[PDB]
Amino acid sequence: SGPVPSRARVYTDVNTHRPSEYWDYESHVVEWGNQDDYQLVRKLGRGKYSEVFEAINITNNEKVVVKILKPVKKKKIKREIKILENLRGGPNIITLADIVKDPVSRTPALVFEHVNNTDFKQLYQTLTDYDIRFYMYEILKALDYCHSMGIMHRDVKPHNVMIDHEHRKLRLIDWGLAEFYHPGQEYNVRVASRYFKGPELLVDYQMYDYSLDMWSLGCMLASMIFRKEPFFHGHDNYDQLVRIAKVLGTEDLYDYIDKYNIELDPRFNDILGRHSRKRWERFVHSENQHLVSPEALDFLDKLLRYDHQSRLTAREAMEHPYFYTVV
Amino acid sequence: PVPSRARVYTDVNTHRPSEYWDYESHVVEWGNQDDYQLVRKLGRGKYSEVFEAINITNNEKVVVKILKPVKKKKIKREIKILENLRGGPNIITLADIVKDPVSRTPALVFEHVNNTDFKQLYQTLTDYDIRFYMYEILKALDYCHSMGIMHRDVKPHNVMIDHEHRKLRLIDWGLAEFYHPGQEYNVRVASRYFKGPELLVDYQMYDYSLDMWSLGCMLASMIFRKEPFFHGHDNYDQLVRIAKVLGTEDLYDYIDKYNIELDPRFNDILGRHSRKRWERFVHSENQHLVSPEALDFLDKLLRYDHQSRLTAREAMEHPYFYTV
Ligand SMILES: CCc1ccccc1-c1ccc(CNCCc2nc3cccc([N+](=O)O)c3[nH]2)cc1Cl
Ligand SMILES: CCc1ccccc1-c1ccc(CNCCc2nc3cccc([N+](=O)O)c3[nH]2)cc1Cl
Structure with a gap:
């Protein structure tokens, strides 16, 4: 009969x-902003299909974390974005601040709280x-x-x-x-x-x-x-x-x-x-x-x-x- | 002058x-609003609606204020002040800070x-x-x-x-x-x-x-x-x-x-x-x-x-x- x-x-x-x-993350509409507002400083780590950087937001002089994703599976990117949006602000959860793409490369990138x-x-x-x-x-x-x-x-x-x-x-x-x-x-x-x-x-x-x-x-x-x-x-x-x-x-x-x-x-x-x-x-x-x-x-x-x-x-x-x- | x-x-x-x-640097932890059931509307102010609600985990009545997020800096300010004054004489008591999973609308939970x-x-x-x-x-x-x-x-x-x-x-x-x-x-x-x-x-x-x-x-x-x-x-x-x-x-x-x-x-x-x-x-x-x-x-x-x-x-x- 099976398990x-x-x-x-x-x-x-x-x-x-x-x-x-x-x-239903597959039906979620992602709005990709302009990455020109962020300047990359240094590489923090290199994972499978992703690279994490320390960066600076030029509009307020604040440090941020930028995760650049290798678009191997588009459905997987929509899943991670929807989950991060749903959990945004939750206790001890990394905070998604922005969703951007560089104008020339068009590579998907996620911006987080430092x-x-x-x-x-x-x-x-x-x-x-x-x-x-x-x-x-x-x-x-x-x-x-x-x-x-x-x-x-x-x-x-x-x-x-x-x-x-x-x-x-x-x-x-x-x-x-x-x-x-x-x-x-x-x-x-x-x-x-x-x-x-x-x-x-x-x-x-x-x-x-x-x-x-x-x-x-x-x-x-x-x-x-x-x-x-x-x-x-x-x-x-x-x-x-x-x-x-x-x-x-x-x-x-x-x-x-x-x-x-x-x-x-x-x-x-x-x-x-x-x-x-x-x-x-x-x-x-x-x-x-x-x-x-x-x-x-x-x-x-x-x-x-x-x-x-x-x-x-x-x-x-x-x-x-x-x-x-x-406590 | x-x-x-x-x-x-x-x-x-x-x-x-x-x-x-420095309220602008304050980190707000938004909990899950699923622990509260809204009962009835009490009042409707400018950029806010106040509701009577029930906390499902202890069967206690609470007041839930839903905020229209017109200015995010203003929300951080009110929260920091409420946290600093929490428990003070004749000051409204902030009990929780929550968001509904689907709407993601900021909400403050107070004593009844x-x-x-x-x-x-x-x-x-x-x-x-x-x-x-x-x-x-x-x-x-x-x-x-x-x-x-x-x-x-x-x-x-x-x-x-x-x-x-x-x-x-x-x-x-x-x-x-x-x-x-x-x-x-x-x-x-x-x-x-x-x-x-x-x-x-x-x-x-x-x-x-x-x-x-x-x-x-x-x-x-x-x-x-x-x-x-x-x-x-x-x-x-x-x-x-x-x-x-x-x-x-x-x-x-x-x-x-x-x-x-x-x-x-x-x-x-x-x-x-x-x-x-x-x-x-x-x-x-x-x-x-x-x-x-x-x-x-x-x-x-x-x-x-x-x-x-x-x-x-x-x-x-x-x-x-x-x-x-
Ligand atoms: C060892 C497991 C454990 C058991 C019980 C209590 C705490 C821990 C623990 C929990 C966390 C850490 C620190 N982990 C740091 C991991 C990390 N540091 C980073 C630094 C920069 C980038 C990173 N990235 O993933 O992109 C990155 N990732 C160390 C420890 Cl010891
Ligand atoms: C005898 C005290 C006194 C002395 C001098 C001047 C005025 C008063 C007074 C007279 C009446 C009230 C009652 N004000 C109630 C206002 C109120 N009732 C509400 C009921 C429901 C929601 C409310 N909200 O704003 O969220 C809400 N706000 C308060 C006060 Cl302090």
């Missing part, structure tokens, strides 16, 4: 009850237990907001979280893989970055939801509190599930695939093996014990679960004792 | 960091207020009631002035009263601004009947004392049962109506003192007028609200010279309030 259907435990019908205007990114390489050596709790709570405010707006980010990872530590400011960026949640919809599993992909993507279960972002957030928490980067170090997408099974165990993996009647790809036959369920306390060492606590391990255990339905939602996560010390 | 500054809270914003008063009708209070009000509520307004004004803010739109429409619970709230901070000594402000503020002489003669270096003139106009209308007290038909005529009570002599002394150049539009309409005695406005229908203390207090608020008017602090110490 068993599934739906989100929260914000299930938020898009169903809204007019098509909100979610963020003064601190170099993290020196920062994780000085980070405290409070700092991790504080910034994890800021990420959860962004996730509960975008999920309430019927949007899944689908690429949560440290590269997509900008922090200005001096001002204690955090922003969730790069909404290029984000999508609108419709119950019963089958999505493409080729999303997120390898180390952050949820088990649903790795076993080809297409009827996933906001809970995918909660797995990716758990991977980030485990790498920070244990000082192990990345936490699940796969070398390919099949090996990535084996790395997860070496921690969570193979017994609970079979319960997951049986609950949803998922057919395991034959490529897992010779590599999966048999693995015991490990205790989270086994990852504690002298270099990371100052970031670990019973509360932190209980919270991590409630995020890193095979069953997407059993993971905490962003709102449930915000009520956990791990955050009792934050 | 001659430079002027406030007699109180002069440098309160000067000694605070830039974050406090069960207002008693203004046209209904007017008949059963006593001398004590006027003294009590005037003191409640003074608590809000001394607080916002101490916080370096001038309301600039003090009028009865902006004061909500729950008479059953004896609760008062100063609302509509859309025209409010931060006071900086020596700053020149826009004179196109406040409602016609409540505009101070400084606004009418185009004197831009005004302060917190503007709010004390407006409060004076409110007191005069209540004790004398004359609404409004100064009934101008346009901004130029408004100055003539004040001149009919305070006289044209003291107006020229005010003008000369600050080297104000009178607009030529006043040439054929201002005329010559005598200074009237406050006792002349007492009649059979209002004598139960008038007293020597009330007239002395009123005389100390309604003065052309903004520097000579009582401060909210000085006003709170007047014998008129000895019974509250």
Whole structure:
């Protein structure tokens, strides 16, 4: 008969009850302004099909961020623009300020609010237990907001979280893989970055939801509190599930695939093996014990679960004792 | 023109960091309006509509103000001021800042207020009631002035009263601004009947004392049962109506003192007028609200010279309030 259907435990019908205007990005009309009002200063990063720059707005002498997009897929550009317009002004969401094209190149470009990114390489050596709790709570405010707006980010990872530590400011960026949640919809599993992909993507279960972002957030928490980067170090997408099974165990993996009647790809036959369920306390060492606590391990255990339905939602996560010390 | 500054809270914003008063640099976090269900329309103002609503997460009634985004800088200003004053005595409480997912229209969520009708209070009000509520307004004004803010739109429409619970709230901070000594402000503020002489003669270096003139106009209308007290038909005529009570002599002394150049539009309409005695406005229908203390207090608020008017602090110490 095929796989068993599934739906989100929260914000299930938020898009169903809204007019098509909100979610039908293919029908959205994009107004491209003149890029002559912005002067490019320096390159910040170079991603797949995009380059990010620091720039200056000549009309008010203010710094901005300009993302120049390689127009490989026009439908994908309309999707990112519509999502950014819908989320504009939301808590800890990057703020879209303008949509422009250079007069001669006609290359699509997005203009955002400036963020003064601190170099993290020196920062994780000085980070405290409070700092991790504080910034994890800021990420959860962004996730509960975008999920309430019927949007899944689908690429949560440290590269997509900008922090200005001096001002204690955090922003969730790069909404290029984000999508609108419709119950019963089958999505493409080729999303997120390898180390952050949820088990649903790795076993080809297409009827996933906001809970995918909660797995990716758990991977980030485990790498920070244990000082192990990345936490699940796969070398390919099949090996990535084996790395997860070496921690969570193979017994609970079979319960997951049986609950949803998922057919395991034959490529897992010779590599999966048999693995015991490990205790989270086994990852504690002298270099990371100052970031670990019973509360932190209980919270991590409630995020890193095979069953997407059993993971905490962003709102449930915000009520956990791990955050009792934050404002 | 001659430079002027406030007699109180002069440098309160000067000694605070830039974050406090630089509203243009303030980051506004717009939440999801899906947590609120609109019930009914309460009122419709210029560039705003006020609705009674219910917060679905705690089953509590709230007030939701939907703003027409005519000027984005003005929205940031009102929000920053409401955030700075949040929780202050008799100040409307900002509870949330939201936008509807499809319309993206800016909206402010406030505490609920069960207002008693203004046209209904007017008949059963006593001398004590006027003294009590005037003191409640003074608590809000001394607080916002101490916080370096001038309301600039003090009028009865902006004061909500729950008479059953004896609760008062100063609302509509859309025209409010931060006071900086020596700053020149826009004179196109406040409602016609409540505009101070400084606004009418185009004197831009005004302060917190503007709010004390407006409060004076409110007191005069209540004790004398004359609404409004100064009934101008346009901004130029408004100055003539004040001149009919305070006289044209003291107006020229005010003008000369600050080297104000009178607009030529006043040439054929201002005329010559005598200074009237406050006792002349007492009649059979209002004598139960008038007293020597009330007239002395009123005389100390309604003065052309903004520097000579009582401060909210000085006003709170007047014998008129000895019974509250
Ligand atoms: C490590 C995961 C984690 C777990 C728990 C709490 C915080 C974090 C975290 C969160 C964020 C960062 C800092 N990430 C910066 C990523 C970044 N910095 C940039 C700088 C310039 C451009 C960038 N771009 O993507 O275009 C860019 N992207 C560092 C860390 Cl340590
Ligand atoms: C006895 C106090 C007093 C002393 C001196 C002069 C006037 C009064 C007075 C007399 C009546 C009122 C009541 N004004 C209500 C105005 C109002 N009622 C509303 C009801 C609904 C919405 C409103 N809004 O503007 O958003 C709104 N605004 C307030 C006051 Cl302060």
